[PDB]
Each structure stands twice: as C-alpha cells, then as structure tokens.
Paper text:
The mammalian O-GlcNAc hydrolysing enzyme O-GlcNAcase (OGA) is a multi-domain protein with glycoside hydrolase activity in the N-terminus and with a C-terminal domain that has low sequence similarity to known acetyltransferases, prompting speculation, albeit controversial, that the C-terminal domain may function as a histone [name] (HAT). ZP_05014886) from [name] (SsAT), was cloned and its crystal structure was solved to high resolution. The structure reveals a conserved protein core that has considerable structural homology to the acetyl-CoA (AcCoA) binding site of GCN5-related acetyltransferases (GNATs).
The [name] (accession No. The SsAT protein crystallized in space group P3221, with unit-cell parameters a = b = 75.9, c = 76.5 Å, α = β = 90, γ = 120°, and diffracted to 1.5 Å resolution. A single mercury ion, which was bound to the only cysteine in SsAT, was sufficient for phasing. Electron density was observed for most of the residues, with the exception of the N-­terminal His tag and the first 30 amino acids in the sequence of SsAT, reflecting degradation of SsAT over the course of storage and subsequent crystallization. In contrast to the classical histone acetyltransferases, such as RimI and tGCN5, with a largely solvent-exposed complementary surface groove, SsAT has a more occluded tunnel-like structure restricted mainly by the 55-residue insertion. In the context of the comparison of SsAT with hOGA that inspired this work, the divergence away from the classical CoA-binding P-loop and the absence of a putative base, together with the potentially less exposed core structure owing to the 55-­amino-acid insertion, support the observations that the hOGA C-terminal domain is not, by itself, an acetyl-CoA-dependent histone [name].
Numbering used by the authors: 56 to 245, 248 to 259
The structure:
Amino acid sequence: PSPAVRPYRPDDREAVEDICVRTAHAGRDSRPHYQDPGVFPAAFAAPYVHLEPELAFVLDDGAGQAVGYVLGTADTPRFVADYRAKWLPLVAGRYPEPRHPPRSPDEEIVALLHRPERMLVPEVAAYPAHLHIDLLPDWQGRGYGRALMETFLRALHERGVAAVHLSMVSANTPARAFYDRLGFHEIAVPGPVTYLGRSTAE
Ligand SMILES: [Cl-]
C-alpha cells in the first residue's frame, strides 16, 4: 500500500481541517499561536470542500488517511458570492460578524473569515481559479506537492478554466521556491501577501 493522490471524500473532512490548522501559520502549526485555530479551516478549507468538493484532492498515506490536500475554486468571483450567501451563515454562530476592529490574532482571522471580498484582488481578475495546497511536515520533500498540483491543474483545465492564482505570505520564501518549481509566476505584491499564478494547461 503506497501513498497516492485521490479525490477528496467527505470522510477526509476531519483530516483536511487538521492539515489546514497544522500549516496555517505561514506554513507552520497555528495551534501554539491561536486560541481557536479552527477559524483557519473555517475560512480557508471547509468552504471549498463544502461548495466545490469536485476540485478537492488529497494525498492518501496508503492506509486511507489524508496527509495533504489541494483544493480551490473554478471561479473566484462566483466563489466569493457563494461564500457569503451559503457558507458564512453556517459559521456565523460559532464566529459572529465582527463589531469592532480586531484586538487579537484570533479576531484578525475572524475578520478575514467575514470578508471573502478580500479575494477580489484586481490584479488576479485574469486568473479566475484559485487554490490552497498543504502537506503535513513528514510528507514534504517527497514530490507529492507536485503530484497534488498537477492533478488540480488538470481538473481545472478539463473544466475549461485556463488560469489560476494563489496567495502566499511574502516572507515565506521556501513556499515561493515551491511554487516557482511548479511553473508559477509573480502576479503582484500589493500587505504581507504575494499573488502567484499560471495557465492551467500542462
Ligand atoms: Cl504561505
């Protein structure tokens, strides 16, 4: 039994959210730094598998357990609308719409959760799809990030979407090299965030 990329299933939800938590702090574990790290998958993983599970893929460890993922959306403007209309009501009880400016790191992420319009960056308009990709530390440096990425790009291209972007923390230079090796170019660095993109054709 060997590790392999496969489509996400609903029984991968727990593992996907945990991978997200464990990589959300500029690639590193968010648990030491946040009171409720569940806000991360609530903003950056769960809505994708809720709304567009057909674009979610996992790295299976060979024993059935997801140990990495790639997920995303075919169309960012539609995703933002759907996120507000369909997703936010499902999490607003647990994470209420903010009434005052963020006081804590936790409240900063809740602010992002409640502003999916953050995704409407003018410079990425020509790259309609976007993604998040993460692997648990023990699974990095094994070629599996590439396997995930190529699977996701093929899925987008098959759906007729020609271009994709992503965001990354600018200071995270190892991530920058990872994306560079996967054929991404710099779109813009507006903020601690860099946007990268490429065409989805192989
Ligand atoms: Cl990052």
